[PDB]
Design an enzyme around this catalytic site. Structure first.
Site, mmCIF file in Angstrom:
data_model
loop_
_atom_site.group_PDB
_atom_site.id
_atom_site.type_symbol
_atom_site.label_atom_id
_atom_site.label_comp_id
_atom_site.label_asym_id
_atom_site.label_seq_id
_atom_site.Cartn_x
_atom_site.Cartn_y
_atom_site.Cartn_z
ATOM 1 N N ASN A 1 -1.223 -1.219 -6.933
ATOM 2 C CA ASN A 1 -0.629 -0.737 -5.653
ATOM 3 C C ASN A 1 0.833 -0.504 -5.699
ATOM 4 O O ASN A 1 1.303 -1.580 -6.634
ATOM 5 C CB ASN A 1 -1.070 -1.443 -4.514
ATOM 6 N N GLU B 1 -14.058 4.577 -3.275
ATOM 7 C CA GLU B 1 -13.094 3.309 -4.040
ATOM 8 C C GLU B 1 -13.260 3.342 -5.511
ATOM 9 O O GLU B 1 -11.965 3.070 -6.040
ATOM 10 C CB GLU B 1 -13.544 2.090 -3.374
ATOM 11 N N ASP C 1 -6.003 -3.635 -6.738
ATOM 12 C CA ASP C 1 -7.297 -3.695 -6.550
ATOM 13 C C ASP C 1 -8.339 -3.702 -7.419
ATOM 14 O O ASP C 1 -8.317 -3.072 -8.654
ATOM 15 C CB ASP C 1 -7.495 -2.309 -5.511
ATOM 16 N N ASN D 1 -8.239 -6.274 -2.888
ATOM 17 C CA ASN D 1 -6.765 -6.340 -2.932
ATOM 18 C C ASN D 1 -6.358 -7.995 -3.343
ATOM 19 O O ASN D 1 -6.972 -8.885 -2.683
ATOM 20 C CB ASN D 1 -6.173 -5.715 -1.920
ATOM 21 N N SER E 1 0.647 -5.393 -5.946
ATOM 22 C CA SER E 1 -0.840 -5.828 -5.809
ATOM 23 C C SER E 1 -1.615 -4.987 -6.748
ATOM 24 O O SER E 1 -1.337 -4.054 -6.938
ATOM 25 C CB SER E 1 -1.227 -6.149 -4.556
ATOM 26 N N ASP F 1 3.094 -1.766 -4.052
ATOM 27 C CA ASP F 1 3.683 -3.142 -3.929
ATOM 28 C C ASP F 1 3.631 -4.343 -4.873
ATOM 29 O O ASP F 1 3.837 -5.387 -4.659
ATOM 30 C CB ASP F 1 3.208 -3.592 -2.172
#
Length: 129
Positions: A46, A35, A52, A59, A50, A48
């Site tokens: 992301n 990650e 992380d 998220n 959002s 969309d």
């Protein structure tokens, strides 16, 4: 902060992640490697909209507030910036909530696609724990 492998394994164990919800410590170290490469300051946007945050790339759609994720929640009740700290407590406490949500560590797609079913014990091999 960029953790070393065994250093992170030790911090995760100290914070009660070791076998949490049945996931051995190597699973958590493996997920963190893919990650964030063990970097607490890792962020990734992301598609969309959002973002992380942190060593476990948590998220803003569900877990933390960043002020810029429409229609989102904040189920960990934390600013997403807390997930970038050198102190991993916020991340670990929020990961505990995530892994309890029903789908286990599958919540981390990198865990499913790079760690699940592998010899994750290698990730803590040689560590003074």
């Amino acid at each position: 902060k960029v953790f070393g492998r065994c250093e992170l394994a030790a911090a995760m164990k100290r914070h009660g992640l070791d076998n949490y919800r049945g996931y051995s410590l190597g699973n958590w170290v493996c997920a963190a490697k893919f990650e964030s490469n063990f970097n607490t300051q890792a962020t990734n946007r992301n598609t969309d909209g959002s973002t992380d945050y942190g060593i476990l790339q948590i998220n803003s759609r569900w877990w933390c507030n960043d002020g810029r994720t429409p229609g989102s929640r904040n189920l960990c009740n934390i600013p997403c910036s807390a997930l970038l700290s050198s102190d991993i407590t916020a991340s670990v406490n929020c990961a505990k909530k995530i892994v309890s949500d029903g789908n286990g560590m599958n919540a981390w797609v990198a865990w499913r696609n790079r760690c699940k079913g592998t010899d994750v014990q290698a990730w803590i091999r040689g560590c003074r724990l």
